[PDB]
Amino acid sequence: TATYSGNPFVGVTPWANAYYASEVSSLAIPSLTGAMATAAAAVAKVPSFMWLDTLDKTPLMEQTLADIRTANKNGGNYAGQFVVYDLPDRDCAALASNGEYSIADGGVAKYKNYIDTIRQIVVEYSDIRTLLVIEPASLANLVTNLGTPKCANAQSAYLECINYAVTQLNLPNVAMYLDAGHAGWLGWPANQDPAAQLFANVYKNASSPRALRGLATNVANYNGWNITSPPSYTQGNAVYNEKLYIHAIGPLLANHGWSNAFFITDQGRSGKQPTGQQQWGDWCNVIGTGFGIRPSANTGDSLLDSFVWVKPGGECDGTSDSSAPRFDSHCALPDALQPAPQAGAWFQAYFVQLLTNANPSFL
């Protein structure tokens, strides 16, 4: 059944979408040989989230859900996985993933229309359990980056928009996880409570939506889940992995009026620890990374609903071309793989790296 009474990953199987599978099979495999080619075909079967990064990407959500509806007839019990990611003045503390809407030019109204579009799809497919990550980077930027003019000015718009998202997508077949950055961002002891306050306030302000299950961490990042050996670049932070992060912030959510908040954590680029990061804040196309813990609801953890692959490995974080639009200097750092295409575009050398360094291995 589509509705759920607790962990929304229980009794379902996350669906591996055709979009990523097409990228692997048609963009990666023709360039590979032997063992690597075979291993790549296997990656295409690991479920990762589909990002709805533009409004005209919404038909792809429908096509995925149509596939799932079909597969659910043949005994199967599959769930759809999507990222809601189109805020006006998006990615306010970076330049690589700037979006189609701006606050100045009716961006809030356009965002509401975008949410309206997604809501209709979810109603159309009320028979399918649908797992959503809400707006990566946004709320975390509001906690830590009010010193960035673009974020400071986006505050009221972000909170209005996110309130609209979590209220309009509050439906019985839906589970939403608000993006909550990662251990090396919001996990810092001094940021934990302010972050928890903001998250609980979003939840409370939205009348405690039943579909709002908790938080998503490590999205498009690389931190370890439960590594017992803290990496050099984590120096100074007692919260050096994602398990420590969720177990630190969880009780603070409860303290601020959000009880029963649960978590999902991205491990799609977390297989190699330590990573090739020379600094913890180096987020763009990081070298020395591999595909990580496979998506699974068997987490052996009180707070983690599921390990997930949110950022699809192989899809670029940003262009390394200083002369191109949306160039962010982070993408030209020593530990950023180069040359890199536009954010979201296929990045073959990066896919090859992730496959080579995969743990668990595909090879």
Ligand SMILES: Cc1cc(=O)oc2cc(O[C@@H]3O[C@H](CO)[C@@H](O[C@@H]4O[C@H](CO)[C@@H](O)[C@H](O)[C@H]4O)[C@H](O)[C@H]3O)c(Cl)cc12
């Ligand atoms: C003490 C210390 C040392 C160091 O080398 O790096 C950091 C980095 C820190 O936080 C970083 O904050 C950034 C926001 O200004 C985050 O960037 C975002 O990263 C996501 C991916 O996780 C990406 O999608 C966004 O576009 C990007 O803006 C970055 O992840 C954090 O590491 C802190 Cl708090 C201390 C550091």
Ligand SMILES: *[C@@H]1O[C@H](CO)[C@@H](O)[C@H](O)[C@H]1NC(C)=O
């Ligand atoms: C509360 O919801 C309203 C809806 O209009 C929104 O404008 C506001 O930003 C929200 N406040 C917080 C603190 O999330």
Ligand SMILES: *[C@@H]1O[C@H](CO)[C@@H](O)[C@H](O)[C@H]1NC(C)=O
């Ligand atoms: C870390 O988590 C993984 C996946 O659940 C598990 O295989 C491993 O035993 C865990 N390690 C520790 C030290 O808890």
Ligand SMILES: *[C@H]1O[C@H](CO)[C@@H](O)[C@H](O)[C@@H]1O
């Ligand atoms: C999900 O929730 C609905 C609404 O209560 C139930 O009818 C269904 O059986 C499932 O548990």
Ligand SMILES: *[C@H]1O[C@H](CO)[C@@H](O)[C@H](O)[C@@H]1O
């Ligand atoms: C309602 O659904 C939850 C999972 O979402 C189960 O854990 C529970 O037993 C009940 O069936």
Ligand SMILES: *[C@H]1O[C@H](CO)[C@@H](O)[C@H](O)[C@@H]1O
């Ligand atoms: C999702 O589908 C898998 C089979 O692919 C099952 O193992 C699971 O029970 C769920 O229906």
Ligand SMILES: *[C@H]1O[C@H](CO)[C@@H](O)[C@H](O)[C@@H]1O
């Ligand atoms: C399958 O889909 C991918 C992503 O849209 C394309 O790159 C590929 O050419 C095929 O259409």
Ligand SMILES: *[C@H]1O[C@H](CO)[C@@H](O)[C@H](O)[C@@H]1O
């Ligand atoms: C793309 O297509 C190939 C077969 O053409 C698969 O092996 C792969 O897993 C992906 O679906």
Ligand SMILES: *[C@H]1O[C@H](CO)[C@@H](O)[C@H](O)[C@@H]1O
């Ligand atoms: C990737 O896309 C090509 C078409 O460009 C297909 O032929 C292939 O099966 C895969 O889906």
Ligand SMILES: *[C@H]1O[C@H](CO)[C@@H](O)[C@H](O)[C@@H]1O
């Ligand atoms: C696959 O990757 C190779 C590099 O090994 C390219 O030459 C080719 O164009 C395709 O992108």
Ligand SMILES: *[C@H]1O[C@H](CO)[C@@H](O)[C@H](O)[C@@H]1O
């Ligand atoms: C990867 O390895 C398998 C093993 O036989 C082959 O079927 C495939 O063609 C590729 O070499």
